[PDB]
Design a protein around this nucleic acid. Structure first.
Ligand SMILES: [N+]
Ligand SMILES: [N+]
Lengths: 104, 110, 105, 110
DNA sequence: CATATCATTTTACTAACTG
DNA sequence: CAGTTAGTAAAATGATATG
């Protein structure tokens, strides 16, 4: 499956890649951790996903989630101050607030 | 579920956001506490909701333990975000010994 | 002894009175508590005076009685709580008279 | 007495105030913690002052008990009030594991 | 006494630094 | 990068102000 995020990125969680519409010939290569976080977020779009859920989907020391979110925001060129993709929900987890569409 | 408050704010408790028709481009970012207070008030529009009911819905139901005064501080922050005058409220009225009351018009979208 | 506060008020702690130069014919009459608070602040100009000192100069050896008297005094001085010109609050330490203070006579 | 910092701010630690010569009418009001940090930094200008020294001067000597994190939060607020860039500081420099350092020019008035 | 606002402290999440 | 240290945002709480 692929996802369209905020009318901008095509995300393929199986190949761990992002493609920016504005730079269609450049493959953005996600680390496995960041790809799995974005996939779980996209599977439950606009839902707040607990740090526990995100954590358990990647690993079996909760600082690793925070760093993986920072890297993902960088690859998405998302602002921490003013997020357009991944929003932090203090004491609750993270929330994918971009428009999310599935293709194929 | 979305709410329209006083014919002015679009409230989304699932995103903790307020959009003011004056500046439809600027999102207003609500903290979870203020959003959950506004949500309970909007679910019971124009009813006086006890401090106890608000404390349980906002904090206890989330597994959070806080003193009573957290509600007062959060009400104060919420009024500031709504630019509601404490002396002459258009949105959130205090009823001493009884709680708080959303007196703005409330409509549900979905 | 009289004090001149911020080039504006003449303060007589002995008669518990304030006179505003902009309204020189009106006597502002202070309650004894507020007058003693102002007097002690004026005796230690621009010093932070502890809540304990202010309280003890007025009342017997609550606490909100000091807070209420400061509020009353700021109203008589037409002082802004948000932007003080006369009596400034020093959180966890007390209050501080920041107006220029002069003794006359 | 007072301090002139970086040829820009007049700092009075007895009044917890900053005056920016660019807006000589606008007093910048410092909290007591931020003012006591700046005061100790200015007493030892361009020296690296340990977190312990700062913690003792700002809180312990005043009779206040706080965690170490209070100093970091207070430094952050102080830099905001000075409009100091954390990435490229003009006023307060962090020296990891050693403390903080006032690198602005410091003069004593009177 | 109850509530409101401001300040301080602490916690939650984020970024920088060094073997 | 790994864990330690520091920075910023948010929450909780304490202090002071008002009704
Ligand atoms: N006492
Ligand atoms: N502080």
């Amino acid at each position: 499956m692929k996802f369209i995020l905020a009318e901008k990125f095509t995300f393929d969680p199986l190949s761990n890649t992002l493609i920016d519409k504005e730079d269609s010939e450049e493959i953005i290569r996600l680390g496995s951790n960041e790809s799995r976080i974005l996939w779980l977020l996209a599977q439950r779009p606009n839902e707040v996903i607990s740090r526990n859920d995100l954590h358990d989907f990647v690993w079996r020391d909760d600082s690793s989630l925070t760093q993986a979110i920072s890297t993902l925001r960088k690859m998405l060129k998302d602002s921490t101050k003013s997020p357009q993709y991944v929003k932090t929900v203090p004491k609750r987890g993270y929330q994918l607030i971009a428009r999310v569409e599935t293709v194929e």
